[PDB]
Amino acid sequence: VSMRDMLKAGVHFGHQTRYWNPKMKPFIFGARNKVHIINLEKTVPMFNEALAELNKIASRKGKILFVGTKRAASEAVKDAALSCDQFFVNHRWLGGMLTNWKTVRQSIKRLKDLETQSQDGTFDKLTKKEALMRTRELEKLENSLGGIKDMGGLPDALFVIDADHEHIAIKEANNLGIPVFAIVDTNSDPDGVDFVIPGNDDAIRAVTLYLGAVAATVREGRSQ
Amino acid sequence: ELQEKLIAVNRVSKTVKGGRIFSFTALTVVGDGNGRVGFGYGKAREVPAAIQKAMEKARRNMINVALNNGTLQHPVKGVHTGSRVFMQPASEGTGIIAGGAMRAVLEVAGVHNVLAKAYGSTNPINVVRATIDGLENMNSPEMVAAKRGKSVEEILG
Amino acid sequence: GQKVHPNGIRLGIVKPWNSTWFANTKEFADNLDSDFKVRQYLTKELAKASVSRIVIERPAKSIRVTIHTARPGIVIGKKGEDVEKLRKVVADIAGVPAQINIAEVRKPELDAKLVADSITSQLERRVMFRRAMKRTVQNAMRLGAKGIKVEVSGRLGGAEIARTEWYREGRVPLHTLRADIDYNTSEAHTTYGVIGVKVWIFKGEILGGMA
RNA sequence: CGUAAAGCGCACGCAGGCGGUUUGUUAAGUCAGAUGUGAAAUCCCCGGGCUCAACCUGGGAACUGCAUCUGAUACUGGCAA
RNA sequence: GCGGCCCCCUGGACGAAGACUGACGCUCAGGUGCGAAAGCGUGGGGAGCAAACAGGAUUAGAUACCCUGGUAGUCCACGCCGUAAACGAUGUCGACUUGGAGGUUGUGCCCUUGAGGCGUGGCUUCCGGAGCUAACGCGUUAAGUCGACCGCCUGGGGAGUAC
Ligand SMILES: [Mg+2]
Ligand SMILES: [Mg+2]
Ligand SMILES: [Mg+2]
Ligand SMILES: [Mg+2]
Ligand SMILES: [Mg+2]
Ligand SMILES: [Mg+2]
Ligand SMILES: [Mg+2]
Ligand SMILES: [Mg+2]
Ligand SMILES: [Mg+2]
Ligand SMILES: [Mg+2]
Ligand SMILES: [Mg+2]
Ligand SMILES: [Mg+2]
Ligand SMILES: [Mg+2]
Ligand SMILES: [Mg+2]
Ligand SMILES: [Mg+2]
Ligand SMILES: [Mg+2]
Ligand SMILES: [Mg+2]
Ligand SMILES: [Mg+2]
Ligand SMILES: [Mg+2]
Ligand SMILES: [Mg+2]
Ligand SMILES: [Mg+2]
Ligand SMILES: [Mg+2]
Ligand SMILES: [Mg+2]
Ligand SMILES: [Mg+2]
Ligand SMILES: [Mg+2]
Ligand SMILES: [Mg+2]
Numbered sequence: 024v025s026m027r028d029m030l031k032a033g034v035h036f037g038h039q040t041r042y043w044n045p046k047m048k049p050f051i052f053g054a055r056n057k058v059h060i061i062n063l064e065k066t067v068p069m070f071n072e073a074l075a076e077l078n079k080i081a082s083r084k085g086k087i088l089f090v091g092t093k094r095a096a097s098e099a100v101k102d103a104a105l106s107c108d109q110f111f112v113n114h115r116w117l118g119g120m121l122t123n124w125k126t127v128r129q130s131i132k133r134l135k136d137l138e139t140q141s142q143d144g145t146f147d148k149l150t151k152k153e154a155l156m157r158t159r160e161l162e163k164l165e166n167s168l169g170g171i172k173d174m175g176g177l178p179d180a181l182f183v184i185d186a187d188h189e190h191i192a193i194k195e196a197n198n199l200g201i202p203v204f205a206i207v208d209t210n211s212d213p214d215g216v217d218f219v220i221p222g223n224d225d226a227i228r229a230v231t232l233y234l235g236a237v238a239a240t241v242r243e244g245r246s247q
Numbered sequence: 248e249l250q251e252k253l254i255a256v257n258r259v260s261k262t263v264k265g266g267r268i269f270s271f272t273a274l275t276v277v278g279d280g281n282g283r284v285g286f287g288y289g290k291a292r293e294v295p296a297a298i299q300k301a302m303e304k305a306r307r308n309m310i311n312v313a314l315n316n317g318t319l320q321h322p323v324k325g326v327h328t329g330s331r332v333f334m335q336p337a338s339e340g341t342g343i344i345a346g347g348a349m350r351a352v353l354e355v356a357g358v359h360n361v362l363a364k365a366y367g368s369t370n371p372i373n374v375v376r377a378t379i380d381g382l383e384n385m386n387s388p389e390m391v392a393a394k395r396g397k398s399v400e401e402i403l404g
Numbered sequence: 405g406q407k408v409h410p411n412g413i414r415l416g417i418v419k420p421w422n423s424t425w426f427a428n429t430k431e432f433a434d435n436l437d438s439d440f441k442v443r444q445y446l447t448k449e450l451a452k453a454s455v456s457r458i459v460i461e462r463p464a465k466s467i468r469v470t471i472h473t474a475r476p477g478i479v480i481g482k483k484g485e486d487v488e489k490l491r492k493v494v495a496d497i498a499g500v501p502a503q504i505n506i507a508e509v510r511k512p513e514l515d516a517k518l519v520a521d522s523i524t525s526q527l528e529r530r531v532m533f534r535r536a537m538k539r540t541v542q543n544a545m546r547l548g549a550k551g552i553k554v555e556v557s558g559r560l561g562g563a564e565i566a567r568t569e570w571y572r573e574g575r576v577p578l579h580t581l582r583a584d585i586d587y588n589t590s591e592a593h594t595t596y597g598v599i600g601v602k603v604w605i606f607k608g609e610i611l612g613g614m615a
Numbered sequence: 616c617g618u619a620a621a622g623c624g625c626a627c628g629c630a631g632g633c634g635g636u637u638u639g640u641u642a643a644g645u646c647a648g649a650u651g652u653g654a655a656a657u658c659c660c661c662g663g664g665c666u667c668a669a670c671c672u673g674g675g676a677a678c679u680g681c682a683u684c685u686g687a688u689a690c691u692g693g694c695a696a
Numbered sequence: 697g698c699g700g701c702c703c704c705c706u707g708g709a710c711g712a713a714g715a716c717u718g719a720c721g722c723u724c725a726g727g728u729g730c731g732a733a734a735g736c737g738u739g740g741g742g743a744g745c746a747a748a749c750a751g752g753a754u755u756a757g758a759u760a761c762c763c764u765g766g767u768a769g770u771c772c773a774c775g776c777c778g779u780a781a782a783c784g785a786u787g788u789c790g791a792c793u794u795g796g797a798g799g800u801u802g803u804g805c806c807c808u809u810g811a812g813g814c815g816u817g818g819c820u821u822c823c824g825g826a827g828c829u830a831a832c833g834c835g836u837u838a839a840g841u842c843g844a845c846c847g848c849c850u851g852g853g854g855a856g857u858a859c
Contacts, residue, residue, distance in 0.1 A: 045794045045825080148611035212825095328830065368830090 024070060024236050029063050032229045034222040037061050037209035044212045050221035051209055059209040066222045070233070073204045073218045074240040080180050080202075081244030088171070089234075090192050091184025092116055096230040100184065103234040104170065107241045110178065111170035112192075121195040124177060130164065134172055137161040180204065182237060185224045187211040206233060251277040251302055252351045255371045256294060273301040274372055277309065278355030284382070285309025286352070286375050310379070313387040317359030320388070325381025329368035332377045337362045348374040356382065410578055410587040410604065417581050418610040425462035435462060442469065442497050449490065453479045456509050456517050467498045470505045474512035513540070513547045516603040520590035523554065523601050527592040533560045533569070533599075541573050544605060551576040551606035562596045576606045583609050 029035070037043075037051070037059035052062040081087060089104035089111040091097065097113040104111030112120070120127055140146075141161060146154040165172075181196045183189045183205035193215045196203045204218040213219040223229045254274045261268045271294050278284040287305025291297035313320065315336070322335040332349060337360040343353055345363035348371040353361055365374055392399050411419055427435050443458050446469065457472035473479050480487050487504050495502035512518040519540050526536040537554040544552040551574030558566040577583050584607045592599040 041796065043795085048794085145611065 024067060024232065026063055026067050029066060029222065029229070029232065032223075032232050033226050034066060034229045034232070035061050035063050036223050036226070042210045044210060046213060047207070047209050047211070047221070050213075050219075061209060061221050061223070063222070066220065069218070070220050070222075070236065073220055074236060076202075076218065077180065077182075077204065077237060078240045078244040081241045082247060085179040085244075086110065086174060086176070087241060088112070088174070088178040088181050089237075090116065090181055090189050091230070093185055093188055093225075095225065095227055096184055099227060099231055099234060101170065103231075103238050107238045108245065109241065110174045113170060114166065116189060116192050117167075118191055119195070120171075120192065121177065121199055121201070127168075127171075130168055131172055134161070134164045134168055137164065177201070183216075184230060184233075185211070186213070186216055186219075188224075190215070206230075249277050249279050249306070250355055251275060251305065252355050253298060253301075254348055254351045254375065256297075259290075271297045273297040274375065275301040275305050276352050276355050276375065277302065277305040278352075278357065280355065280357040282312045282314040282357060283309055284312060284352060284356040284379065286379060288372070310383050312356060312382045312385065313390070314357060315387070317357060319358060319361055319382075320385055323381045323385045325377040325379075325384075327377035327380060328370070328373045330370060330373040330377045331366040332363065332374060332381055333366065334361055334363045334378070334381060336360070346374070347371075349378050352378050407578065410585045414581060414583075414585065416615055418584050418613060418615075420615070422457065423460050425460075427462070438467075438498050442467070442494055445497055446471065446490065446494070450479060454512065454518060454521070455479070456512070456515050457507075462500075465500050467494070467500055467502045468505065469494055469502065470507055472507045472509050474509045474515070474518055476506050476508045479506055511547050513543045514549055514586075514605055514607060516586040516588035516605050517590075519544065519554070519605070520588050520601050520603045523556070523603070524590040524592040524599075527556075527599055527601070528594055537569075537571050537601075540603075541571050545573050549605050550574055550608050551604075553604040555600075555602040557600045557602075558598060559594075559596045560599065562594075566597075574606065576604050578604070580609070582611065582613070 035052070040054055040057050040059060043051075043059060050062050050065045052060045052064075054060065077087070079085075087104075087107075087109045089100050089109060091100040092112065092115055101111050101113040117127075137157065138161060141158065146157070149157070177199065178201060181192060181201055181203045183193060183203055186193055186205040186207045187210065189205075190212075193203050193205065195201075197215045202217045203215065204220060205213075205216040206224045207213045207216060207219045207221055208224045209221075211224075213221075220233065222233070252275065254276060256274075257272050259270050259272055261270065270290055270292055273289045273291075273294070274286070275289075275298065276284065276286045285305050285308050287301040287303070287308065289297045289300030289302075289304055291300055318339075319334060319336040322333070325332040325334070334345075334349075334353075337344070339360055341360045341362065343350055343358070343361060345353055345361065346365050346369065348369070349363045349365060352375055353363065363378075368374075388399050388402060392402050395402070415421060423439055425435065439460050442460060446458055447455065450471065450473070454474040455471055456474060459470040459472070461468045461470070471479060478486075479490075487506065491502050491504045494504065509515050509518070523536050523540055527533060533556050537556055540554060541552050551572075553570060553572035553576045555568065555570035557568040560567060560569065576585065578585060586605045586607060588603055590601045590603075592601065
């Protein structure tokens with residue numbers, strides 16, 4: 024990615040001065056009109072290093088969990104994660120997805136049971152209303168766990184949009200040693216993130232820029 | 248293969264409209280006998296279930312300690328709440344000299360020769376935490392040489 | 405509160421009747437009385453044979469008794485002798501000729517009656533009620549019960565005030581009519597009175613029903 | 616030493632305790648070395664004799680001290696700027 | 697502790713730019729002084745208020761409680777006393793350590809200045825991170841990180857009592 028490329032998308036904007044985390048001082052270029060301007064000189068090289076590490080992880084059969092639940096970017100995260108044979112969470116992150124992986128496994132088992140049943144049969148052994156009720160349950164479970172339904176085990180890395188928005192997932196990852204790459208705006212706390220990418224986290228264009236770079240590097244690592 | 252030791256069992260109670268509800272808590276410590284030790288604390292209505300929850304919790308949340316032939320690298324102080332613990336390396340033959348709460352943790356950890364003493368509150372639950380923290384911050388000559396940018400003998404010799 | 409008998413509510417849905425014959429009003433009561441006498445005699449005579457279920461059918465002018473037991477060899481004896489004597493006395497009790505068949509229950513730990521009998525026998529033979537009931541659930545879940553619940557009740561261990569205690573693992577939906585819940589009961593006559601033991605075993609649901 | 620016992624009601628201020636930074640000098644404190652002395656027994660170490668041990672006993676270490684002399688001058692002190 | 701306005705005398709604090717002296721500093725046992733209110737001595741003054749008191753409804757009793765008067769006192773001048781939940785229940789001084797929103801009081805620069813935008817000090821209130829604490833909480837005005845000196849503390853009751 025290019026410095027011009029990020030500046031065009033507007034990565035450099037941040038939140039207001041009154042809403043900021045002091046720990047992000049090194050990555051803040053300054054302020055104009057009472058709004059913080061991030062340092063893209065910090066953004067570009069760190070993003071390249073994150074791409075390199077993600078390339079190694081993906082090249083060793085690594086499982087990558089794309090996480091972002093902002094209503095603005097959820098669809099983009101879903102499509103970008105599916106484009107590269109990886110896993111995503113596009114709705115509200117359930118507290119304990121990683122630390123309560125046992126219960127999430129119970130939910131995945133429920134999903135597999137329901138679809139296997141709905142295709143083998145036994146809905147002809149159930150009232151048409153029971154059939155519809157079980158279908159509705161299956162649909163809800165599919166929405167809840169579609170992106171991780173086939174993850175199988177603990178993920179090997181987390182990519183996060185709006186570290187503050189997804190701090191719970193960052194907390195579970197920190198507890199479980201999973202490396203976190205996170206788009207961290209001026210208002211967020213970068214301590215829990217192994218690889219912090221300092222830049223705008225709201226603009227859909229910038230989100231798509233980050234995600235496209237990540238997906239390209241992941242596919243490079245996958246092709247071998 | 249890991250060795251597990253139950254340090255203390257205690258009965259707690261909660262009061263509700265109908266009366267007192269009795270429960271139990273279990274404090275256990277698991278270790279590999281070679282420098283890796285974890286502690287667990289579980290709650291349940293019955294003692295065996297409480298102990299089993301404690302064991303499961305204790306297997307995780309475990310840390311590594313850089314032992315030196317069954318003894319510590321250097322004297323160490325640990326502090327948690329009101330439990331101030333002091334440990335020091337000892338010569339061979341001394342064995343485990345410590346109070347019960349520290350004794351179990353050090354035995355399952357593998358420290359064969361150590362002199363220990365607990366000051367202040369001897370509450371087992373906090374004594375175990377302070378011992379674990381003290382043993383965790385204890386560094387080794389190779390790590391301190393790595394930090395200081397020199398070699399081992401450059402510190403030792 | 406007070407709950408309906410699981411087998412009673414489920415009869416005709418997912419459970420079969422123990423007695424299966426037709427009779428007009430002129431002989432229905434007589435058949436019931438003969439059935440009661442035959443079942444009583446067989447249960448007492450085979451108390452130590454792990455008999456799980458006595459199905460009495462009345463074909464024409466004859467009576468076929470099928471004994472579901474977990475120990476067929478004891479009931480049969482060397483070359484059928486014991487079956488023969490049981491048949492010869494059941495024929496006496498019934499009046500009409502009698503035939504006896506033996507059905508083995510492959511996994512007794514999933515049979516409610518047999519589980520209750522084991523627990524009752526242990527309690528009479530002086531064992532800890534908690535240990536006994538916990539051991540039967542563990543064995544039931546091991547053998548694969550989708551769910552199991554045991555309830556012991558009344559002067560446990562010789563306590564002056566009777567108390568009720570029950571364990572339950574898995575799922576035992578008693579309001580689901582299509583569920584297969586094998587339920588039975590036993591009483592332990594001990595030196596301090598009667599201790600009642602109820603056992604529910606849930607072993608899956610039945611959709612097609614098949615009555 | 617906020618609430619468990621424990622900050623004087625508050626301020627000034629004598630005796631006392633401590634004191635910014637540079638240079639010189641002093642050797643008071645400090646450090647090093649040496650000498651004398653620190654009774655013998657007791658404790659400790661290596662041995663020896665009562666058939667073993669207690670016990671007796673040889674040599675040594677120790678007795679962290681005190682005083683004197685010759686050195687070191689970083690730090691504290693004195694004096695001078 | 698201080699509350700109409702005015703005058704006379706007086707103390708302290710803060711800021712801007714400089715000039716000057718050159719360690720002259722901090723703390724403090726005993727000591728000295730100030731120290732709300734109630735109180736005591738002398739003499740004034742005495743509107744309102746009001747301990748004590750008196751009366752008015754008042755049961756083996758009026759003590760209560762409520763009303764009607766109401767003295768001491770409250771005020772002044774001078775002495776004494778020297779105690780309070782005299783509390784921020786946080787001894788004095790110095791140094792270092794992420795922020796935010798306010799208040800109050802100086803002062804610099806700049807927009808075209810008034811309004812307005814950029815700083816830079818003092819005091820002060822509320823949130824809050826690290827850290828600390830038994831927790832509660834404290835959090836650049838610390839209860840964090842250290843340094844100097846002082847004042848206390850050592851189970852509760854007896855008792856701040858006896859001599
Ligand atoms: Mg816990
Ligand atoms: Mg104590
Ligand atoms: Mg009913
Ligand atoms: Mg107190
Ligand atoms: Mg004070
Ligand atoms: Mg001096
Ligand atoms: Mg000096
Ligand atoms: Mg000298
Ligand atoms: Mg001597
Ligand atoms: Mg000898
Ligand atoms: Mg000798
Ligand atoms: Mg000097
Ligand atoms: Mg004084
Ligand atoms: Mg007065
Ligand atoms: Mg007077
Ligand atoms: Mg009046
Ligand atoms: Mg009055
Ligand atoms: Mg007067
Ligand atoms: Mg008093
Ligand atoms: Mg006082
Ligand atoms: Mg006051
Ligand atoms: Mg106040
Ligand atoms: Mg006080
Ligand atoms: Mg002073
Ligand atoms: Mg705060
Ligand atoms: Mg007194």
